[PDB]
Design a protein around this motif. Structure first.
Motif, mmCIF file in Angstrom:
data_model
loop_
_atom_site.group_PDB
_atom_site.id
_atom_site.type_symbol
_atom_site.label_atom_id
_atom_site.label_comp_id
_atom_site.label_asym_id
_atom_site.label_seq_id
_atom_site.Cartn_x
_atom_site.Cartn_y
_atom_site.Cartn_z
ATOM 1 N N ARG A 2 44.449 48.683 44.387
ATOM 2 C CA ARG A 2 43.037 49.016 44.426
ATOM 3 C C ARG A 2 42.328 48.077 45.390
ATOM 4 N NH1 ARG A 2 39.525 48.710 39.015
ATOM 5 N NH2 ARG A 2 41.697 48.484 38.311
ATOM 6 N N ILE A 6 36.768 50.812 45.438
ATOM 7 C CA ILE A 6 37.295 51.293 44.164
ATOM 8 C C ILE A 6 38.535 52.140 44.335
ATOM 9 C CG2 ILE A 6 35.272 51.180 42.672
ATOM 10 C CD1 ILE A 6 34.389 53.839 43.672
ATOM 11 N N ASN A 7 38.369 53.198 45.108
ATOM 12 C CA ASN A 7 39.432 54.149 45.389
ATOM 13 C C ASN A 7 40.783 53.442 45.386
ATOM 14 O OD1 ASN A 7 41.331 55.278 47.716
ATOM 15 N ND2 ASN A 7 40.195 57.021 46.871
ATOM 16 N N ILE A 8 41.815 54.158 44.950
ATOM 17 C CA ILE A 8 43.171 53.614 44.906
ATOM 18 C C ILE A 8 43.992 54.251 46.022
ATOM 19 C CG2 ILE A 8 45.328 53.675 43.612
ATOM 20 C CD1 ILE A 8 42.082 53.412 41.710
ATOM 21 N N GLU A 65 31.943 53.172 51.441
ATOM 22 C CA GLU A 65 32.089 53.525 50.029
ATOM 23 C C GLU A 65 30.759 54.007 49.459
ATOM 24 O OE1 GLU A 65 33.465 54.715 47.982
ATOM 25 O OE2 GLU A 65 35.521 54.353 48.663
ATOM 26 N N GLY A 66 30.805 54.851 48.430
ATOM 27 C CA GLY A 66 29.574 55.345 47.849
ATOM 28 C C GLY A 66 28.320 54.740 48.454
#
Lengths: 114, 79, 177
Positions: A2, A6-8, A65-66
């Motif tokens: 990770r 966040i994403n894996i 990211e977001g």
RNA sequence: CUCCUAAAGAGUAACGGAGGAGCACGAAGGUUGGCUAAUCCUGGUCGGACAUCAGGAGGUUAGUGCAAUGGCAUAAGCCA
RNA sequence: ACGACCAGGGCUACACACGUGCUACAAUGGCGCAUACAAAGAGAAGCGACCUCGCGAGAGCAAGCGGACCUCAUAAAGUGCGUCGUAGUCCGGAUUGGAGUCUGCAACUCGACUCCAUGAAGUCGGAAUCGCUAGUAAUCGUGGAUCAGAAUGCCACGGUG
């Protein structure tokens, strides 16, 4: 494993696995692996945790990211609330960059309806 | 997408804007220069931009700086 | 019992003067943390609800309680008495050892974290918030994931108003947007 | 079979006014232990007017294998 | 005025239907590095090398060339090695956001191109239907006209075959 994103990412070549992050393409992935010191052809496995912490430390420099989703939503919302030409093209789901609407607008218009 | 050697604005519109800001609040500015860039000294004025048949009133805000004037005056009618 | 010990020594005397309480018993407390998992779609197949409750069993170490439909409603086409979802209530130190497990581990994991809301209070001093992802907990491994079902978390406090309610969790350093 | 007509005991007619039954259940029976609704409001992943969760209001407006009536909290209601 | 001049707009719209094409759905392939072999053309308000700066589009400086001499101009499929290992993928590139370059008085309607980011449909296509008999079909690049800028079209050229 990770990432600060966040994403894996999957367990595959690091240069392609880092692409799973929203905001990291091939060029940015190569730049991350270069500035970190990790080879591009090594999998995400066989990477120490100290090396993944290094990759996180480098990806923290980018807005990927977001957070980036938020900045894109903010720009499109500003366009729509401003009421400019691009704002109206975004409001109606029509092509924004001058493409023809007589035919071939299926990406913005979606499946055709009689 | 114009080069980085400075934005474009028609000179008549520029002088109209300076005369409008130096003389205090005025009437809407009737102009046909849809290609002029909105500058920070135009914030607060309402420029009536030609759209082909009419002059659409456009009240300029700080969020509009950098756009062209014609971006806020649609030229095609579709319902 | 980390924050449990941190409760009786630190957050009581700052709150005792913050509201000028006469007795220590007036300070709010935390009775129970109940985790709800409304499956809803288990009527199609119930093999997915047991492993769904298997996840909730790993989040808190307690065997879940399968809730049944209180009444038949066709709007979601279920007859009364169907296994519709599981839940777990946590009391005592198992609540505490979980209460720090999210505020220090459950907080720094949620995607695109922006902070919790201060308006999500019941109106009488009880907080409730829902997490959308279950892979946010260390227990549940990413490898073993058949679905991405979330869950709700509500905080039952002896507080009487939301002001006393928000003041208590703020003492535990709760993210308040 | 239940209510009204039926005139405050019982009973009481009409091709009078309204509804049901021709079963069900080895648990939906016995006992011991426990339990207490409807509806609505507020907050809360998917989740919606309506699912499960939490709190407050409310106080039986619910429930009772099935018609109506009379009952039912010591519950006759609900669970083991 | 059905004549003439001007500015702005439109010819670029968009529920939809058709014709002609380009790109794909991949492993006879994608990507990375190395390297081989063309023909035909254009160029003076033009082609513009070398060098320097830029990730790049390009910019600055500045030769040569009215050209079998100089420039456009590195052919690409191919070949060698490595990787990917059948997945909506290291396939596919649509769309969109941000940042720019150049032409041009002026890139909003409505230009081309570059960089970063995103990554639609699409896994070979119903009824039906088209082209082609040999250096042909198929596939791969190259050039020119129009042209300030704007080719997936047109006209031509060669490679494999």
């Amino acid at each position: 494993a990770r990432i600060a994103g966040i994403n894996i990412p999957d367990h595959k070549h690091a240069v392609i696995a880092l692409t799973s992050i929203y905001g990291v393409g091939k060029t940015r992935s190569k730049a991350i692996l270069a500035a970190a010191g990790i080879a591009e052809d090594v999998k995400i496995s066989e990477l120490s945790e100290g090396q993944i912490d290094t990759l996180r430390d480098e990806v923290a420099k980018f807005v990927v990211e977001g957070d980036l989703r938020r900045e894109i939503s903010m720009s499109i919302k500003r366009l729509m609330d401003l009421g400019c030409y691009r704002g109206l093209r975004h409001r109606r789901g029509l092509p924004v960059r001058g493409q023809r609407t007589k035919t071939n607008a299926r990406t913005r218009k979606g499946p055709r309806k009689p | 997408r114009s080069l980085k050697k400075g934005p474009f604005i028609d000179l008549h519109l520029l002088k109209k804007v300076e005369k409008a800001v130096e003389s205090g609040d005025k009437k809407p500015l009737r102009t046909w220069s849809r290609r002029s860039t909105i500058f920070p000294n135009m914030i607060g004025l309402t420029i009536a931009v030609h759209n082909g048949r009419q002059h659409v009133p456009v009240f300029v805000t700080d969020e509009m700086v950098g756009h062209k004037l014609g971006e806020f005056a649609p030229t095609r009618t579709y319902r | 019992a980390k924050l449990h010990d941190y409760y009786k020594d630190e957050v009581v005397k700052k709150l005792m003067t913050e509201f000028n309480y006469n007795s220590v018993m007036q300070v709010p407390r935390v009775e129970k943390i109940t985790l709800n998992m409304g499956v809803g779609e288990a009527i199609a197949d119930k093999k997915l609800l047991d492993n769904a409750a298997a996840d909730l069993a790993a989040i808190s170490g307690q065997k879940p309680l399968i809730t049944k439909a209180r009444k038949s409603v066709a709007g979601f086409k279920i007859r009364q008495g169907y296994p519709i979802g599981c839940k777990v209530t946590l009391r005592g130190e198992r609540m505490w050892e979980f209460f720090e497990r999210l505020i220090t581990i459950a907080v720094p994991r949620i995607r695109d974290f922006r902070g919790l809301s201060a308006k999500s209070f019941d109106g009488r001093g009880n907080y409730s918030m829902g997490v959308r992802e279950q892979i946010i907990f260390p227990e549940i491994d990413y490898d073993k994931v058949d679905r991405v079902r979330g869950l709700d978390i509500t905080i039952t406090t002896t507080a009487k108003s939301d002001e006393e309610g928000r003041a208590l969790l703020a003492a535990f350093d709760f993210p308040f947007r």
